């Protein structure tokens, strides 16, 4: 039951460094990243999936200063995913999306492709020109991807912890993201929690429905 | 198989106006909204769940002019969820979160609660004071909730479609969100697609892993 998953998944505070994702699970988490939906299927993202010791250590460099409390999570987890957003929406990328959809057979007629291109252009330009906030818009799509991912790995029986407690400037420089047109937003270590994960047994806590929901 | 769900769920283009969620399903989608994770468990959100014809009509007011092509999805679906984010992070809310966590038994000592409070305050101020982007920070938590939600309803065998194509100013006015300290971000109609929902049969399309993923 997916609801049981939602009620039982938790942010792992300590991973068992000896437990690695199986080959199949490693392939599956990549599929989750890839198939998340996004506005106009813009997929304005890039992911760094670190599973080697050096790779994880490089990501862990971002857990400096007061963020050191997140260092071990990055080092001990099996796979560490760095969620990145594009820094600017370029036409090349927009054409890429529609050309891929065409290649995937989503358009039965040329008019179907044109309507899809027109729609994407509308939203892309609204953010790139009218509101000048495509950076924020794309980052929001990335966070949506994170939400999809956390529940997905949870449903797979895998543990993880979403992390905002890291220095993105440091992480960006470490992987030369800026030059590639990306910037890091969330780091998500994935693996299996150890018995020393105090958060594995604490009850989950959320404000009451009477406060967060309005029915009409 | 959550991966099969990710490969099969789709953005519903048409809903069967006669198929409603069961009472149990209605309770479950609300649980999904409530239990989504968030930075510091800040839960900077509110949700409008319209299930009555009048309720959906009010939300559909936002599907005006340019967005009229999204009106029927909002009217024919069983339940329509409007994801809202807080417009500013006030101390009052941060207090609510920590007090709820204490009530739920997440702290072993008063010192533990204070430590949790200070930590949350640190992240909160980083956005409210330093970066002056707490509005965007919270909106990102909402999108993450949206991501969690879409996969969840998909895993429930339910159909839904995320909608950015609506006028938030109109929606905000209609539900007096501004006054409540909230703003509408995404509308998600939930229900059962109709036989006319062509997007249910079109193949899914995403860019290749060789482009979006870097393994290290
Ligand atoms: C975007 C985001 C960033 C977060 N950052 C951190 C972090 O830096 N370190 C950490 O241990 N937990 C972090 N958390 C975990 C939150 O404290 C957690 O999601 C919340 O308290 C609810 O608990 P749950 O995830 O167990 O359901 C983050 C969560 C989100 C959604
Ligand atoms: C934030 C967001 C906003 C979206 N807005 C709309 C919309 O206004 N109308 C619509 O029909 N689809 C909308 N979509 C659906 C996208 O076109 C869709 O998610 C994407 O093309 C991938 O297809 P899939 O969801 O079927 O996997 C939206 C998706 C997201 C994630």
From Swiss-Prot, chains A, B:
Pfam families documented for this protein: Nitroreductase
Listed EC numbers: 1.-.-.-
Binding positions for FMN per the UniProt entry: 9-13, 70, 164-165, 204-206
Cofactor: FMN
Subunit: Homodimer.
Function, in words: Reduction of a variety of nitroaromatic compounds using NADH (and to lesser extent NADPH) as source of reducing equivalents; two electrons are transferred.
Protein name: Oxygen-insensitive NAD(P)H nitroreductase
Species the sequence originates in: Enterobacter cloacae
